[PDB]
Design a protein around this ligand. Sequence first.
Ligand SMILES: *SCCNC(=O)C1CCN(C(=O)C(C)(C)Oc2ccc(Cl)cc2)CC1
Ligand SMILES: *SCCNC(=O)C1CCN(C(=O)C(C)(C)Oc2ccc(Cl)cc2)CC1
Ligand SMILES: [Mg+2]
Ligand SMILES: [Mg+2]
Ligand SMILES: [Mg+2]
Ligand SMILES: [Mg+2]
Lengths: 5, 5, 236, 236
Amino acid sequence: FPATV
Amino acid sequence: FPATV
Amino acid sequence: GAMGSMERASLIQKAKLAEQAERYEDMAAFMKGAVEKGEELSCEERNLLSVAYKNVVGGQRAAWRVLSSIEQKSNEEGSEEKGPEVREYREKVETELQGVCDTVLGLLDSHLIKEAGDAESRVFYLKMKGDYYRYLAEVATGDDKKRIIDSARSAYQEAMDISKKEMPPTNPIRLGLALNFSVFHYEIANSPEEAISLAKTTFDEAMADLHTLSEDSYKDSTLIMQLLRDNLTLWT
Amino acid sequence: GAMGSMERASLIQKAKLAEQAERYEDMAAFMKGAVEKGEELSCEERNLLSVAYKNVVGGQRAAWRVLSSIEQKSNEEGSEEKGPEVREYREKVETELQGVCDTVLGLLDSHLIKEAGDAESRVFYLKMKGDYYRYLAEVATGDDKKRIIDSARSAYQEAMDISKKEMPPTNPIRLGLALNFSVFHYEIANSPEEAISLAKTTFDEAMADLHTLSEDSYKDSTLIMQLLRDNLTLWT
Ligand SMILES: *SCCNC(=O)C1CCN(C(=O)C(C)(C)Oc2ccc(Cl)cc2)CC1
Ligand SMILES: *SCCNC(=O)C1CCN(C(=O)C(C)(C)Oc2ccc(Cl)cc2)CC1
Ligand SMILES: [Mg+2]
Ligand SMILES: [Mg+2]
Ligand SMILES: [Mg+2]
Ligand SMILES: [Mg+2]
């Protein structure tokens, strides 16, 4: 899964 | 802390 | 609200304690109580609100993915029928997740967004609105799905428009917004080229503005730039 | 009970799903529902019950320790008065922990222990009874504290007496019981020499019986023996 903040 | 199971 | 009798400052203090104890459900309940006092949130308080709910919903999303995978496996040719239980329990977790998202969206709509006049606060809340609609979109399958996706897009777009006019390209909220909107494009809107373009442009515009920053601001901006790069590496 | 309408087999199936999703509160609620169906639990089902509650209460204990430390720090000379909030929130977590322990003890008392006639099942439940009284003892401070400690001791002692008569010294339940009763002696009963003696004797008697075991039983027994050794290393 891609990075989110 | 010591080990417990 | 169960928190209606507790002082605002006490709710904030307990949210910080809950964070230290990794009690994120409690942390979110305290911050909901603080929001419901009706006053605007400071920068620190906005962080506490977002950290709390991000962790609660993050755990729900991880669980939903595990259960969805089991359910998908159970519906493959050759799989032995196990009954309704996997679906039921995935639905239970899904409904709880939807409830948390609806709660956060309700706080933003009543009345955090409308009372946020400074760009930094308004962008912060609109990012959150995009994020929580995005989490609803991850589980959506009904007549409403396209509208949930568009609600996420619309919130992110307004946040992007304000952030480009009012904040420097290295601002961490602007950067995190762009990171997450890029993920929206890739994972939700089926627009991988838009996701890649946005991540690249955001990274490059931040790079060009690093020279203006103190060492402490540089640390935050470069951390998020590395996440943009990580996604670009995953996608290319 | 909210689980009264769900089939026993469905509750067990959902407990296993909850474990896979790391949803231990759900897992415990499903297993409480299964216990309340009134039938004895198989070995696998006993494991699910214990895993679920161990994880729930383990998280509560970790949180209580964080909060207790903050509270102790706040009551040192030189500390600035922060109000009642740390105490209140530590008390909240404490009360929730006590509630979970009371729930588990209630399941054991109604009627898991009394219906457990085989040594392996009865010892399993009596170990749990000692453990959950031990967790109550960790937070206890009132007129009842000595009695809570003695309830833990009494449950562990009966489990030890049965296990020595009816199970080999390498049995994992017997070994885990002895590990935990040794920790009781050290941390709760203020009997460090008893804790060290019990850990050493348990380790040595298991060592002498390893030659009887298959490779798979050997793995489980030696894992617990290593935990006994780890505690001995911490204590000596
Ligand atoms: S002024 C509003 C509150 N402040 C923040 O949200 C900051 C918290 C700390 N922080 C971060 O952890 C990193 C560097 C990862 O960036 C972001 C985190 C969360 C968001 Cl919403 C955006 C960026 C910086 C922001
Ligand atoms: S037959 C009763 C159910 N079985 C068990 O409790 C086993 C579960 C797996 N297992 C372990 O994880 C280790 C080796 C750590 O030992 C114990 C775990 C839990 C307990 Cl209560 C006792 C030992 C073996 C037991
Ligand atoms: Mg649904
Ligand atoms: Mg563009
Ligand atoms: Mg108390
Ligand atoms: Mg002895």
